[PDB]
Amino acid sequence: MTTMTVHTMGVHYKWQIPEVLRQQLWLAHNLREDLVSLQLAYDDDLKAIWSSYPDVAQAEDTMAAAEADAVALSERVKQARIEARSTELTQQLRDAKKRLKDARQARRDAIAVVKDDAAERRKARSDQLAADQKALYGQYCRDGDLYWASFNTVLDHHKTAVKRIAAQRASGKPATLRHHRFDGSGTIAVQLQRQAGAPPRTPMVLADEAGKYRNVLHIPGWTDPDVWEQMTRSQCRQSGRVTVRMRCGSTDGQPQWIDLPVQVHRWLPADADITGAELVVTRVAGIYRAKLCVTARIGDTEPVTSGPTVALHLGWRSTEEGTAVATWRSDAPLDIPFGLRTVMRVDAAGTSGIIVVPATIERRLTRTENIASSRSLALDALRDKVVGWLSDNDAPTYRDAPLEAATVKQWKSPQRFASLAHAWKDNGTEISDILWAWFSLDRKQWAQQENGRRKALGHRDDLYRQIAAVISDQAGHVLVDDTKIDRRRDHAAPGGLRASVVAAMTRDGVPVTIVAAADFTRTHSRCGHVNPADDRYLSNPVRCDGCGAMYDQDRSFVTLMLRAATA
Amino acid sequence: PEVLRQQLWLAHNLREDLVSLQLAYDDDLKAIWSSYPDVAQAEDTMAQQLRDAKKRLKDARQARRDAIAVVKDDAAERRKARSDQLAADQKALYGQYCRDGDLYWASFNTVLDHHKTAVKRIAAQRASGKPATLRHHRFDGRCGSTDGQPQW
RNA sequence: CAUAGCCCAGCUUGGCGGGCGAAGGCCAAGACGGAGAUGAGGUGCGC
Ligand SMILES: [Mg+2]
Ligand SMILES: [Zn+2]
């Protein structure tokens, strides 16, 4: 009964956005941005406190000197490359990089040794941070128009993000939070309060028009899924067009609701316990798509006992019909649906196979990239033409302010051009036609340049998700490794396959085992010999040192995974 | 006010009439062009394997435009006469909408400019090979006159 | 405005019919825990 589930419901595209919902997203944006600013302030205070220690000061000075030397040697290497227009200097740069890394390690050690001394300072700063957040809540809710559920959702997103960033900094990339501009896309939420000794907030309670949550969330017309699976797709998709009443927010101290047209495709089991509902507004190519997500609690499933062990392995080796994204082996023969037989290949015995992604995904993403490049060139052409016209003519006022060729010359994003164009719809100036002729065209392309991508990516996700299902249909146990060239890997992205497989195995209760993939690729299954060279594997197949015969590295990988599992 | 609603309804009505008149005027020009036997033959002709058809289609499209240019001078009077016909009909709508209607004359003048502005953009747009056109927009919802009584 | 893509009751795939910033949807197979485009830092809105 611990498991949580989330069901998605789409909103009608011929639905506008009320003024109250815009006000809520605006406030949510402002809250998130102030929170990011406070996060950076807190981080700066922490860095300053760390720096306060004289040993840390010395380490930081050494680090700064090493960084300056490294950047100077990088400049020298760049100058040598320019003069050559394309080894000892690189070695000096490598030495500088080593010195910088050593200084960084020394600084980390200096922080570590003195860490127990500034704990009180760090706790005091963190407490001040918490107090500032509480003041933010008092402003936004007790004195503001934000609904307290949305504030909680934004805070939870923010604290998830900060942990993500801290993990990334610990794990490499010195990334950080970046402010964002209010495009009009946001998140709102509503919580379901269930005090102690209260009846479950059953989905049937929600469909009541006089229920305990008629003022908070109401999705009329629920059906038992047992009946639902028998209704034809016609009455199914016709029945799901229902009108959700949702508490949205307050304006001048008055609650405001919205009435979303949603098309529900799956209902929740009668024993469920809803937790909350969050409405997500996304902008893609200037179209406001919305989506309502409902989260609840559901009883767990009994873990399986019978079912062959299935082992999976990942790569990104190429194949003439698409990227070969995985190789799977099974303890016993498996059954694969007929609609997927051209994506999840199978062998004669039915116990081995290759997962490939059809190349059409690659072709579509390449089309998107080429449309991106062409849009960039046409963007530059319009920039030049508008600059020329502005130089040779008068400047009608934009935002009640004269337009200067320098400012127009510095534009890089389409946004400024778009706003200017919508401003000069009917000025009668020729540039306006020149400023509209581009605009419309690009929004046809912009749609494609985004939508196709998402659509194409969606397709790939579908395949992976479908694959997950089939394995959980038969597998009593599933094993996974703990593991142009990068672009192809960014298109196929086996990481998605791993995530979907693990998620499906968790939902269905199948045991998941992470195999230690250490010393496997260099290891041949048949001859049992490791191979020290780390460059022979770039091609397939690879000759074996212990046997002198070429073998499939992936097949040996899955064979070894099964053998280690079968111990 | 209902006066505001009716004026917009008249405003929506006027644009449809102007759009209706334009296409007939647009069709009349097409009929004027189709009169020449060379134009009609090209239209019938207009009416890796992908590229061959596309090339021939545009060549047929270009030839129809080519036939238009050569006999442009010989049809100038006929095109003007229908052009004068369109203006007179457009003038007639002023009497029905403004002289004999409650629609404010400023509203008519504004929309007339917008349509005339629209056709200028459209006419050149179709010229190079980039087609688009006016279509009927469905009604969605001083303040002129009311049975000859001005209202504010 | 490029010459096939995008869109038209969640999503992806097929098929029927439509729209090119607007319209118009219908049918079928399957699957589904929401929470990741560095482009911005606007202090309300690529209409
Ligand atoms: Mg859909
Ligand atoms: Zn061997």
Residue numbers in the entry:
A (entry chain A): 1 to 86, 91 to 487, 509 to 592
B (entry chain D): 18 to 64, 95 to 188, 251 to 261
Sentences from the paper on this structure:
A recent study demonstrated that the type V-M (formerly type V-U1, clade 2) Cas12m2 from Mycolicibacterium mucogenicum (hereafter referred to as Cas12m2 for simplicity) exhibits RNA-guided dsDNA interference activity. Cas12m2 associates with a single crRNA to recognize dsDNA targets containing a 5′-TTN-3′ PAM. Interestingly, Cas12m2 lacks target dsDNA-cleavage activity, probably due to the non-canonical His–Asp–Asp (HDD) catalytic residues in the RuvC domain, rather than the canonical, DNA-cleavable active site Asp–Glu–Asp (DED). Hence, instead of target cleavage, Cas12m2 interferes with invading MGEs through transcriptional silencing by strong DNA binding.
Most Cas12 enzymes auto-process their own pre-crRNA into mature crRNA without the involvement of a host ribonuclease. A recent study showed that, similar to Cas12a and Cas12i, Cas12m2 cleaves its pre-crRNA upstream of the crRNA scaffold, and two conserved residues (His269 and Arg270) in the WED domain may participate in crRNA maturation. His269 and Arg270 in the WED domain form base-specific interactions with the crRNA scaffold, suggesting that these residues are responsible for crRNA recognition, rather than crRNA processing. Indeed, a processing analysis of Cas12m2 revealed that alanine substitutions of His269 and Arg270 in the WED domain and Asp485 in the RuvC catalytic site had little or no effect on the pre-crRNA-processing pattern. These structural and biochemical analyses suggest that Cas12m2 may process its pre-crRNA in a unique manner. Intriguingly, when we analyzed the cryo-EM structure of Cas12m2 complexed with a 56-nucleotide crRNA, we observed an additional density close to the 5′ region of the crRNA. This density aligns well with part of the distinctive sickle-like architecture of the REC1 and REC2 domains in Cas12m2, suggesting that Cas12m2 may facilitate pre-crRNA processing through the formation of a transient asymmetric homodimer. However, because the present resolution is not sufficient to unambiguously elucidate the residues responsible for crRNA maturation, further studies are required to fully understand the pre-crRNA-processing mechanism of Cas12m2.
